[PDB]
Design a protein around this ligand. Structure first.
Ligand SMILES: CCCCCCCC
Ligand SMILES: CCCCCCCC
Ligand SMILES: CCCCCCCC
Ligand SMILES: CCCCCCCC
Ligand SMILES: [K+]
Ligand SMILES: [K+]
Ligand SMILES: [K+]
Ligand SMILES: [K+]
Ligand SMILES: [K+]
Ligand SMILES: [K+]
Ligand SMILES: [K+]
Ligand SMILES: [K+]
Ligand SMILES: [K+]
Ligand SMILES: [K+]
Ligand SMILES: [K+]
Ligand SMILES: [K+]
Ligand SMILES: [K+]
Lengths: 282, 282, 282, 282
């Protein structure tokens, strides 16, 4: 059983300990649930105002007296500011409620618009993670590697990547805890990430996986968490992406196949079909 | 008397030295005060325009001449853009004021909407601080600890924590000042904060609390300030949270009870009911 | 003649080398100029549409034929979406222009609103700089100092300060250039800036002002640039503030008077009236 | 053939591997294509509603029965909330569709406004890169240099620059890959970038171009990538700019001509006409 999902999530059941977190909930519900809630408020509030018009007499011209249907659509046409002409307020009481309803609709529209904007303008990084990792020799040291690819043409600037080892360990006192280890990389910052980025961790005497083998990583239930962050030119916003690997997904001795190929014309090309391809010696 | 409140605020009375800070004030007033101010401008400006229509003659059809009530609701129906039909401008003077009023309402609506958005889209971190701290041995050193918990399912990426010692000290010259000490942590950056995070400060010869005891921390009036910062996936915005501890809230020899429990099914679980539980030896 | 103004600006005349920078210009013009430009577009575009209605015949009911005045206010009432009733489109040509005008007004309103929001939501740090600096002994070293004060109750988190020396220097080749020197501080990051922050630069053998005197700083035309940055809780946005000092504004041997005073009640207080006070020995 | 364009882009053909990326596409299409798509939805949705009114009978007063033209403009006047008066809904079915259409238009307007804002508020850094680089002696070491200029009066705070060497290299195993080298600079952070900034890389034993010549940089196909980032006061947003140089654009022995000149009045001036001027010895 893996403690981190492939997408970077945690696979832990939350035991624990309708308006205490209203701003969060309105942003995280699905769009159908969101559109439903907005429609609800839109109707409930109109009904309320419709009842406020009947509670002061027949103050709506060309409206069947005491008819809720005719009063509702007058509220609709008032809150929306359509103002057809047939239905119109008469009497100082109705005109004051109209004044209030218009204010209430503007304030509610601004809140709904704020939430729509906040939900809609959530960019995705468009970054692809290698399905596996590898441990092969690079510059004379065994090196843990994975790689990233930009699925869009627009570039990502000040791109950062963080490679975390997650394994169970035993302290000097004998306490069995789960520790996170920041793994030093040859390059943790790519100022302009455009195409493909091979991320490397030299396994030297300082590495927390020095001397480890395929077996020891399983016994410690080792996992590898990857976080990517950058500023996407397409959106002019920051983006991020997360991924996680299990020890079973490290191909020892593997080499990532070059995704850069030379066309017959001499043009340098990027073939992402080889992105997950790994060469093994037998 | 504590100099920092539990929530991270300062407990200092500001001796010191209605429009000099209008943007700040409009964002910091309570919602009832905010809604009240907006309603005020909404009525005052309409009244002003209503008086601008009477100051040019009876230029409102179906409106009692010189009646402010009928002129006000015409301004309302004009600023809001309802445009029922009974009340309508007549004469080039009224139609020019209508043109101005519509412009004034759009500009005011945009400012009101900007403020609403700015006030509404203020996410909260949803982070829980341990009620106490502890000082127990970890990896062979006495270690100061507290811990954090994410009260939501959505993860927080690039989470940072900063642990500051605040105590009165005496310089070589004899000046008694209050100094802030950044306390080095085993982990100050958690790339993906999902569940629980135990923060640790090894008390070695470099620590500003090396050799200190429960008594010395009180005599120096020592306090501990904690700041948390991260990027919350739920909101796609940054969040932060602050907390402060007094020396009286350090449980020497204490150990935080594990909040990770193993269910009978083998599923890993998170029980936040034990989050504030601390084990003491007697 | 000083090369940096007290507010951090540069005092250099730009020799150099109406729509090439439209987004910048619309954000930087004064509000009167901005409101004027928006009003302009609002009238010009309405006039244009008014001429588009006459160029297709008398397609406006209750409108004097060929009258521009009556056609303009119909465009106003259409672009604003008031729709009184007297003036109404007749014929497929007018109704198509109405359809276009409504689209054009919505698109223009969205751009105007975007600019209003972008201009309006520009918070100010509310930070006060000490009028002078000082060089006195602290912890056994001559230390350059200034201090900052938060003029608001809301706190600023992850506050950074940067102290830059700016002076003319001569390279080994003999080139006379103006170099910026980052001055190391005892604390460059205050995780929670609430009240007052004394910023200190120990003048040791590593400092670029080691061995300098009041005279040498003038001969080199030394200046000191200060930048402050933080995340203001009042606005939930980042803020910054800049200041610059001349050598003539360093009080050698000076000590900033404590702004923290003890009231008779035992409450700790902050008296910003002493913020610019400096003690000198004679 | 150069692998990086002068503007920092990559010159690689993407081989690869209409709604899968809708938010990205709507932000990256040209304004004519964007305005066209918005106009499309604006008409298609109105047509749909127009057909929803005919599919329930002649429920539009003063509208030719079964006429799509008259029903379309009623939808327009309803979605836009103009509400002239001639065309008006009759029957509970039409008034319910009107209620729905108004809701649909508000929701669509909010999405369109969000996209407009997101597209419009994309500031440009206004930064100028030197057309060439140089390698001359500075402080006793051969130093690689280029420089930047602020084309606007407003200052940029916390300005960062990153200089990356890009060249083909051979690992100990014999693998021919393209490596990025972060080049250490005398100053990588300018807290307040106002005028001109000469960026310098001392070529010492640590530099990856130590011992290299004009010939060796070509044989390795060396290129130099520059990224600039800062917070622009004009916009209160972050900005960035990228540039790339080829080995053919390094002027060995060159010196950038001083852009700071002394006027006859003693005022310090900035002449950006000399910004690309470089002095060579013969
Ligand atoms: C002030 C509300 C008027 C129309 C909607 C705009 C809200 C963002
Ligand atoms: C330009 C104002 C029209 C309606 C309100 C939108 C302001 C955000
Ligand atoms: C889509 C424009 C309708 C009203 C103004 C809202 C623009 C932010
Ligand atoms: C809620 C929509 C009403 C008018 C347009 C405002 C959308 C930002
Ligand atoms: K409205
Ligand atoms: K209307
Ligand atoms: K009407
Ligand atoms: K909006
Ligand atoms: K907005
Ligand atoms: K409006
Ligand atoms: K808005
Ligand atoms: K409108
Ligand atoms: K807005
Ligand atoms: K509308
Ligand atoms: K309207
Ligand atoms: K409207
Ligand atoms: K908007």
């Amino acid at each position: 059983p893996r403690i981190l999902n492939s997408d970077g999530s945690s696979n832990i059941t939350r035991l624990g300990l309708w308006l205490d977190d209203h701003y969060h909930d309105l942003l995280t519900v699905s769009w159908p649930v969101f559109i439903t809630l907005i429609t609800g408020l839109y109707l409930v509030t109109n009904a309320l105002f419709a009842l406020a018009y009947l509670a002061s007499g027949d103050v709506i011209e060309n409206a069947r007296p005491g008819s809720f249907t005719d009063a509702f659509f007058f509220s609709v046409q008032t809150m929306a500011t359509i103002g057809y002409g047939k239905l119109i307020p008469i009497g100082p009481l109705a005109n004051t409620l109209v004044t209030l309803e218009a204010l209430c609709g503007m304030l509610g529209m601004a809140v709904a618009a704020s939430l729509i904007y906040a939900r809609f303008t959530r960019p995705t990084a468009g970054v692809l993670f290698s399905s596996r990792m590898v441990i092969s020799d690079f510059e004379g040291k065994p090196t843990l590697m994975m790689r990233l690819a930009n699925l869009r043409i627009e570039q990502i600037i000040e791109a950062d990547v963080h490679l975390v080892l997650v394994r169970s360990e035993i302290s000097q006192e004998g306490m069995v805890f789960r520790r996170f280890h920041d793994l030093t990389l040859t390059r943790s910052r790519s100022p302009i990430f455009s195409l493909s980025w091979t991320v490397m961790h030299p396994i030297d005497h300082h590495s927390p996986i020095y001397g480890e083998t395929d077996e020891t990583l399983r016994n410690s239930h080792s996992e590898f968490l990857v976080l990517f962050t950058g500023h996407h030119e397409a959106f002019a916003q920051n983006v991020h992406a997360r991924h996680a690997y299990s020890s079973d997904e490290i191909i020892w001795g593997g080499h990532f196949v070059d995704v850069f190929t030379t066309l017959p014309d001499g043009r340098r090309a990027l073939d992402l079909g080889k992105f997950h391809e790994i060469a093994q010696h037998h």
